[PDB]
Amino acid sequence: AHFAPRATFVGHNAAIESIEIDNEHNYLVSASRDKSALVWKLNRTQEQWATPFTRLIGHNHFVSDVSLSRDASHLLTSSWDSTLRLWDLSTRTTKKLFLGHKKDVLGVTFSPCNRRIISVGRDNQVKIWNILGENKAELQCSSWVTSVACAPMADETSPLVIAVGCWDGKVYIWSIEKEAKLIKEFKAHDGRCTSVDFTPDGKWVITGSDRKVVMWLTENGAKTISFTAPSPVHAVAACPTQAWICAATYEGIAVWDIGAKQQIDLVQPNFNAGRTPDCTCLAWAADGSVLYSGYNDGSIRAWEV
Amino acid sequence: RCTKVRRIIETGLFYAELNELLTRELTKEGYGGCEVRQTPTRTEIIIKAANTKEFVDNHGRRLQEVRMMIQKRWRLKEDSLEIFIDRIQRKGLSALNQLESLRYKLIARIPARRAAYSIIRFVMDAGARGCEVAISGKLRGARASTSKYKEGYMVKSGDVTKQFVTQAVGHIPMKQATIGIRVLIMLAQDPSGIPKESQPDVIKVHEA
Amino acid sequence: MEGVKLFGKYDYSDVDFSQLDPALVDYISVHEKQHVMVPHTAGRYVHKRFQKVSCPLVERLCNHLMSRGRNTGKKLLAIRIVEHAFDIIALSTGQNPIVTFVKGVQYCGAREDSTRRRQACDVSPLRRIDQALSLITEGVRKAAFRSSRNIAECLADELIAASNNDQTSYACRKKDELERIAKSNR
């Protein structure tokens, strides 16, 4: 069902590229184009939802992507600067930078179990670092790489699956174990492949330039279903708990119910010859309570079902 | 035992005297500049010219007239001086060389049209983007009057003049009056040849 | 930001701008942002036209009183003189200086002037309070030159009579010539 405006809150002057939330609740971090990445903390008390907790001043360009420990201690973040930065959560202060990656770095994730840092950008390689900070594996691809995501859980032994979405069109999926052998490679999108996320269970995967959100299979490949968005969508992210999938267009956020197989809702809040704000990222909380979305003027808006 | 300033300036002042010297000796051999390598005890110099055979004739006597003239001037020790020669590939595009060809003609009473369009054709066919030739002074009349002969295209402004445009000024004394010769020659950039980078005017878009 | 007072003495709580009159007050520049502990500042006020409004008004006087050719620069001199006016103003009358100051800035600058026959144009409020501060400070140095008397006093003599609308003042005499010339030419 549809959901009302809970709270806008702002502390961030340029746009927001990405956004992520630490485990359970409290503490979300909005990576910002300003080159400064905040962390908040959530009161959820009437008028103010959150207030800002730290600022991470260190990079010399926009901060692309931001990724978090299971503890919510030792978060990592990357920029076009061509480096990454581990930042102690409590005292800020960079712990160690990363050096090796040539061009602007667009995508970061951890594993589930704090094992392998997965940086990626426009040198056409997914680097796999150690948590120590030294380069283990150097996987390869045709074009630039916008986005990555990691399969949940796996209990250590299971291969930890890495979906990737490219600038040319293609969508790579990889195993790890040790050597990292790609399960499948496919021409997932017609032109540009913007953003990639997993289904929580991880049978399926999500990618989608040509106004088409397409789910695919984790093993081996080929499509389950193809939807059609109204106008071209920048970020995609499935709900944790319930069977939803959601997609940040210009016109709103297109809320597919996956079984019923249709857009139930489209939520933009109200505000000649101007663009007016796009939404460039989504973030479901870990409970599936609340939906945060980061915006192009420099704001974040919360909605709760 | 010098300052850090003076070792630069002495070496500069060495080079400019050396280069004005080898205008006046190597007019016949066809001079095209030089490079000087300076060491506290060893000096190595590359002379560059067209007629490399004209040195080596008479079992290399012509170079040993020059080498003593350098040695006695600055009072350097032999063994510690080490001259070579290295040949000019493409004499067409070096400016000091092609100046001398236009100097060679106008002494021997060729018309100035024919003298320019000798060398201006020879420059362009050899491999260059443009060239200009000026012959300033007194032919025919009592007043002096300027010829300018140009082809191709010839960039006159900015930084990009200094990188691309070779040029060379001179003069011919005569029975009647003092003419001035002047030859500007623009180059094409090579891919890492012997300039590297293209002009800041041009850009190139890739094919899809 | 609770006291907030000039030279560490006077306060801006007073000065009743609404009370002073209608119009004129706006280009006055005594509205909160303008208040500062010391009138000295790193000015960036000559960049784009109307930015002179957003600076403090007491500073704008201290700049006018910077002439001629020997006193150029040396602002740090001028803000002593305007201090030692604002002692003489306050401790003689018992009004505080800033109230009786801004009344002087009202009534000096003439409405109208001969635009080069000659025709009598009206004025902007910006050009009034400009030609307030000139015709005060012009009179001060013209008086103080050769006069065996300190210019802090000769400012304070000019500045009191500007408020009370007397023809003692070099300001308020010189407007009634300039305003009558506009009335004559017309």
Place this chain on the structure above:
Amino acid sequence: KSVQVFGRKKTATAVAYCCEGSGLIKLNGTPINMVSSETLRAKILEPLQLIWGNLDIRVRVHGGGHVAQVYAIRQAVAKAIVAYYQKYEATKTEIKNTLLGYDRTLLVADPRRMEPKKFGGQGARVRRQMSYR
């Protein structure tokens, strides 16, 4: 806990240095009462009047003349207070707002520097004086 940041007008450069302490602010080797002016006393304290009883600041300077050396210190005090609250965020953004409400020079500084001298004239833009006839 300690933070080390600079101010800068014209060609002054004043570094300041926060610690934990007991409300001591010290220029060169001495309290910032002692600048001997009565204008420029009140100019350095504009940062502090708006807003440090935890903090202990220790300021050293070079460059500039008498005025611009003060305007570096107003930057170095105010920035070092703001840089302390940033490291050691809610309250930093609102106390920083009180300065930027007052005046922009306490954090930002100004990039203007003197124009080089040009030939044919005694300074930059002035030129000597013509004759004619």
Place this chain on the structure above:
Amino acid sequence: IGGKTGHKGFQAREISADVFVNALAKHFQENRIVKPPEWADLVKTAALKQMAPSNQNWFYTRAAAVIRQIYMHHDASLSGLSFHYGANLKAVTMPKHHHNASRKVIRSILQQLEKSDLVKVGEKGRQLTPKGQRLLDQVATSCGKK
């Protein structure tokens, strides 16, 4: 607000420079430290200066100032002090230049101070001795109480 120190009592750095230097001038006239020279008394402080000093006890207020300025720069030379106490040259039709002070007046003091042991000579300029910088923090607590 005002600058606040630790350390309870007062030191030579703390109290103000116009005040301190004159209290240290008085502290020689009572004690018979320094003395006046007897040859001098009519001499210009510097050749550039247009007249003798006004004060007649001027010798001591200079001799206080040099000990104050040995304190604040640790070392103090003669030629360094001579350059300091000079000024611009005022009279002539040309533009004005920095000329130096007299040496002899300043030398006379820095020998007279080394009689009562208030300044040793060392490497680089002269630097004040354990006896010396004690005498300043006598006068700092004299004028700190005041």
Place this chain on the structure above:
Amino acid sequence: VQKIRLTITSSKLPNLQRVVGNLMGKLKKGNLEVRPMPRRRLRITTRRAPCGNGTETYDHFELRIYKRVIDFQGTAEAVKQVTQALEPDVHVEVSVI
């Protein structure tokens, strides 16, 4: 062993940056441990017209002096090999301390 300084000087920066690369490169091979000085603008400001005619116009001729200092501990055997770049308008003073 007599910890030795190089001191590398040049007119032109591209010609310098070859020699710094080589003399840093060779301390990789020999394995000797390896430890920018401020550049001078020699401004000479001649009046550009020959005669006294015309408006007084002045060309400014900056010669530039880029200056770098590598230094390292090295045993006289190893240092003879490293010293021997040979570039146009570059100098290298060796200095024992």
Place this chain on the structure above:
RNA sequence: UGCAUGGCCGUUGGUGGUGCGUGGGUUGACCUGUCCGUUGAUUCAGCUAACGAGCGAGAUUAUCGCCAAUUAUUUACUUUGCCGAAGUCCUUCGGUUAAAGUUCUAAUUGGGACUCCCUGCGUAGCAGGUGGAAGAGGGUAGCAAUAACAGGUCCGUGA
């Protein structure tokens, strides 16, 4: 002898200008190309017997301003620790191949600003505003077309 000349420089004018290939117009000098808004600008936009290549403008070079990587304990400093002198319970000085560095200092490689963003006005662009170290060529210089002046210099020259 600069009114016999070379080079170099000032100036007309550092303004926005200059003129080729093929085509067309004219008996011809010659014209067209090189013409209702915009820009510092023959700058772009679009008209259109012209279409297409130039040169100058722009780009580029140099520096000033803001960034953080890369180095520096005998050529810059800072912090902490030691040993001094005073204070005399913790404050300030001076020294130190002694441990960690880089905010000041020094200088190389890159990042950064584009009318991108919003609102008015009229596609080219313009005015204001937010943010920003910096906003409208970011500031200041350097370089600077063709065509000439009987302007200057035979007292700069082994012109």
